[PDB]
């Protein structure tokens, strides 16, 4: 039939991509990197512990001054901490008690949150009155909100479980671009060093490269067997790293069309659900579901440390902008800052 | 070191003290409330209703899609799950498979379930008229006998009452041959008539807490 003719064409197009991608693959990253001296064993220890949440924590974000911090728990409160000296600067009640994300503003004036509400809210931190109000509410997605990041003091990108991402306008309040193409719930996104490209992983074991200026997928990547939980761009603009729920992490190369390295072990069975990078880019920190985190070596793929000290599932993970400390959150409501 | 610097530290401490005071006030209202989930399947409204001193707080999920493998993990700390077994093809079996997934889930392996076989109009009148409900789908219904403890109140063809106790035992086979006594199931019949079912929820959450305390004291 007519429908069957189109399907046969897609198989031919798939093979030509495979042939070209296989042709360029000449060596492996392991062969070139097997001359560099291995890094020593790395040990850390907690410096600051923060208390005051009543339920499990779901999200956190560092400010662009390496001192302030925001958090969100499944209780209905957002708390702003001071890292150097344990203090509280704000504590904001929420209209919905089931949140799943929070963010920070490059300038330091607004904070956002989202959840099963399906709506994103923005709060004005600098009010001449003194209290904290609600600036605007953004409505239009049909599913639970997963991620959201500030691009401009007037623009913000969001992703939801209705298999769609969008770009919003804070002033008017309506979408300006809509992205389609995933066949599964979008779980995370990360912005480039500039503000012109970003990536997104979903429950279809896939990732895509998008463009804010014109909506379209520049490159589609494949590899992980199961659903993908976290993702983080490398500090160069030419690669990224991903973590899926089959006890694996992979490092894809955006400069060309293919994957480079894998980080796997036989003993580990649980999921990742957390990934990040250090400032130089030679140290990969990935959370895990067995109440612990690990430290790897992205240029050697050999484990070099652990992080024990959480008695429940690790949910969030972040590294400071200048690179001085590592913040970790868990379902035990005990944020701990490591060094 | 300077006049302004000294006031800075004192200013922060004063603000922290005010914040921590109301956090202690909110800790008492969070401890005294029980949370429920209305998983009616087989618009995201949250309603706070209160019976006497007891305040309850349930959540209904009507805006999501039919893929629950990701947003169902957010209800790890709820007291109980109210599953409404209410509305051709197989409809009892589709609800039957959904129960087993929840019952065996890794993060929901310590949560009790309250069953409401609603739509009492679903009857055995269809056995002799139109298409029968339990006709070919369950071939073992032929050689089944009612329990000796069946109590038909207004009564009717024993046939209807006999068919009722066949469905109840099907959910109990899944919920018994499983993990140890950290959770149970509370079947009930609701004739889809009035809101005297709040009473059943009040009387079922009381056994859930009571049996939890008797386990840590070895009783």
């Amino acid at each position: 039939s007519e429908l069957d003719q189109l399907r046969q064409e897609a198989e031919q197009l798939k093979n030509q991509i495979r042939d070209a991608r296989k042709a360029c693959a000449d060596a492996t990253l392991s062969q070139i990197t097997n001359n560099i001296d291995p890094v020593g064993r790395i040990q850390m220890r907690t410096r600051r512990t923060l208390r005051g949440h009543l339920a499990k924590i779901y999200a956190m974000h560092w400010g662009t001054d390496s001192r302030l911090l925001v958090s969100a728990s499944q209780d209905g409160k957002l708390i702003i901490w001071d890292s150097y000296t344990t203090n509280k600067v704000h504590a904001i009640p929420l209209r919905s008690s089931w949140v799943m994300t929070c963010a920070y503003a490059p300038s330091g004036n607004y904070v956002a949150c989202g959840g099963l509400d399906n709506i994103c809210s923005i709060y004005n931190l600098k009010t001449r009155e003194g209290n904290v109000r609600v600036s605007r509410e953004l409505a239009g997605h049909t599913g639970y909100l997963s991620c959201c990041r500030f691009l401009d003091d007037n623009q913000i990108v969001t992703s939801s479980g209705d298999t769609t991402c969008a770009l919003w306008d804070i002033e008017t309040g309506q979408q300006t671009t809509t992205f389609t193409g995933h066949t599964g719930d979008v779980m995370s996104l990360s912005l480039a060093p500039d503000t012109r490209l970003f990536v997104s992983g979903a429950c279809d074991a896939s990732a895509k490269l998008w463009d804010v200026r014109e909506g379209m997928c520049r490159q589609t990547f494949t590899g992980h067997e199961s659903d993908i939980n976290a993702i983080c761009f490398f500090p160069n603009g030419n690669a990224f790293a991903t973590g899926s729920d089959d006890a694996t992490c992979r490092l894809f190369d955006l400069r060309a069309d293919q994957e480079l390295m894998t980080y796997s072990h036989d003993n580990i069975i649980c999921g990742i659900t957390s990934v990040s990078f250090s400032k130089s880019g030679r140290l990969l920190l990935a959370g895990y579901d067995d109440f612990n985190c690990n430290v790897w070596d992205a240029l050697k793929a050999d484990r070099a440390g652990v992080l024990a000290g959480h008695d429940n599932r690790v949910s969030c993970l972040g590294v400071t902008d200048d690179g001085m400390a590592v913040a970790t959150g868990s379902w035990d409501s005990f944020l701990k800052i490591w060094n | 070191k300077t006049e302004d610097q000294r006031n800075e530290e004192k200013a922060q401490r004063e603000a922290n003290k005010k914040i921590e005071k109301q956090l202690q006030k909110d800790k008492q209202v969070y401890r005294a409330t029980h949370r429920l989930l209305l998983l009616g399947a087989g618009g995201i409204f949250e309603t706070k209703f209160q019976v006497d001193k007891v305040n309850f707080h349930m959540f209904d999920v009507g805006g999501q899609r039919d893929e629950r493998r990701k947003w169902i993990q957010c209800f790890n700390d709820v007291t109980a799950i109210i599953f409404v077994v209410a509305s051709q093809t197989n409809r009892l079996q589709e609800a039957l498979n959904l129960f087993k997934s929840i019952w065996n889930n890794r993060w929901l392996r310590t949560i009790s379930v309250i069953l409401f076989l609603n739509k009492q109009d679903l009857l055995a009148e269809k056995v002799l008229a139109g298409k029968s409900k339990i006709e070919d789908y369950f071939p073992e219904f032929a050689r089944y006998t009612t329990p000796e403890d069946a109590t038909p109140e207004p009564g009717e063809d024993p046939r209807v009452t006999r068919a009722k106790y066949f469905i109840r035992d099907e959910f109990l086979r899944i919920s018994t041959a499983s993990g140890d006594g950290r959770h149970y199931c509370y079947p009930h019949f609701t004739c889809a008539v009035d809101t005297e079912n709040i009473r059943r929820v009040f009387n079922d959450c009381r056994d859930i807490i009571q049996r939890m305390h008797l386990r840590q004291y070895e009783l």
């Epitope: 066949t183 599964g184 067997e225 659903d227 089959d246 069975i269 | 899609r65 493998r69 589709e94 065996n104």
Partner: nanobody
Framework: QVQLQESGGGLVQPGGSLRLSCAAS????????MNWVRQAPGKGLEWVSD????????SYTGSVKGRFTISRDNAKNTLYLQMNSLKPEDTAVYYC?????????????????????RGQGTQVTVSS
């Protein structure tokens, strides 16, 4: 890169037997639990049978019990289904599923309007 493909089927008299075969690649066949899901000529989607990682635990819907059997062979990565004595109501499109996570006992998505890990089905008709 994950892909599932089914083969086998045709037109049969109201009485007899058939067999179905599915080939898989990409992931590790040992660690996942499979399923057999069938549609209907215009009537939702419903579950037929499923197996475990090893050939030890089985289950059946009940409508077809004592007639269908399911077998797994972890050497060529093939899933089989053998039929017996089919009736006029046994005509639909058959698919093959796979649970979302490897080392689990509960599946929350094998049946859905859209499934990311289900193949494209095959048509079988029992005519006279």
């Amino acid at each position: 890169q994950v892909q599932l493909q089914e083969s086998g089927g045709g037109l049969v008299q109201p009485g007899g037997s058939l067999r179905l075969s599915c080939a898989a690649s990409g992931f590790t066949f040992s660690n996942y639990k499979m399923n057999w899901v069938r549609q209907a000529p215009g009537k939702g989607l419903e579950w037929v049978s499923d197996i475990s990682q090893s050939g030890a635990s089985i289950s059946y819907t009940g409508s077809v019990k004592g007639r269908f059997t399911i077998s797994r062979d972890n050497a060529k990565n093939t899933l089989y289904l053998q039929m017996n004595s089919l009736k006029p109501e046994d005509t639909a499109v058959y698919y093959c599923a796979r649970c979302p996570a490897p080392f689990t006992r509960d599946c929350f998505d094998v049946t859905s309007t859209t499934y990311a890990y289900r193949g494209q089905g095959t048509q079988v008709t029992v005519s006279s």
